[PDB]
């Protein structure tokens, strides 16, 4: 891809656990350590935005099919997509979203989806940046530099980072039991 000013610091902090800083990562056939850690970084990104957080879940989004092909396109950018209310009826098939109850693929009008879109190492809160850096550091530890004690401390410190990031999520978007949900909103109408 393209160099990013914060992503180089991420790949550097992966190698902060083991060894030396690389520079700028902008070559395919290159420093194998940097490109390898960059792959681990993007994998932990694509996994850490998979779990569902309340800034990533774009709620009422509308997708539109192509006018010629009449066929709305699932993507690898579309990380995990579900329907709005319940008993979601959309699934990927060929690379295209598909109804499993209407038994059809061609859509006339648009479609309303709760979708997760894949974002970068940037466009994320610093809580989640520290958590992707620490979990990818644990993976990079376990797969190349197999030392036991640094694995123990990165496991403990991953748990602390996830603790902070759950605190960020329950502080982002205050969820009150009795005045904000769908069932016991109507029970307390006088």
């Amino acid at each position: 891809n393209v160099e990013t000013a914060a992503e180089l610091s991420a790949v550097n902090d992966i190698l902060a656990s083991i060894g030396e800083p690389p520079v700028s990562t902008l070559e395919g056939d290159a420093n194998a350590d940097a490109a390898n850690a960059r792959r681990i970084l993007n994998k932990i990104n694509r996994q850490i935005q998979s779990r569902g957080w309340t800034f990533n879940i774009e709620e009422g989004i509308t997708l539109l099919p192509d006018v010629y092909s009449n066929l709305i396109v699932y993507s690898d950018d579309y990380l995990s997509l579900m329907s709005t209310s319940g008993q979601s009826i959309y699934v990927n098939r060929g690379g295209y979203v598909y109804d499993r109850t209407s038994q059809s693929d061609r859509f006339d009008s648009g479609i309303t989806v709760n979708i997760i879109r894949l974002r970068d190492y940037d466009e994320m809160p610093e809580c989640f940046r520290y958590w992707i850096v620490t979990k990818a550091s644990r993976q990079f530890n376990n797969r190349f530099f197999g030392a036991p004690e640094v694995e123990g401390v990165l496991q403990e410190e991953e748990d602390e980072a996830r603790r902070l990031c759950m605190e960020y999520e329950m502080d982002y978007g205050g969820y009150n039991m009795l005045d904000g949900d769908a069932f016991t909103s109507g029970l307390l109408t006088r």
Partner: protein
């Protein structure tokens, strides 16, 4: 005449140098409202159940 005034203004609890009256519920309003809150919750806390 002074004594046979057909407009009769009635006060419940009188106070000195004050043209109107204060209700009897006023004097026990606060423990009334402290009941209100304390009771309100309970109903709300029931609904969570």
């Amino acid at each position: 005449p002074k004594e046979a005034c057909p407009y009769i203004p009635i006060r419940m609890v009188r106070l000195d140098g004050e043209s109107y009256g204060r209700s009897y519920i006023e004097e026990y309003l606060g423990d009334l409202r402290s009941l209100e809150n304390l009771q309100e919750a309970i109903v709300k806390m029931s609904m969570i159940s």
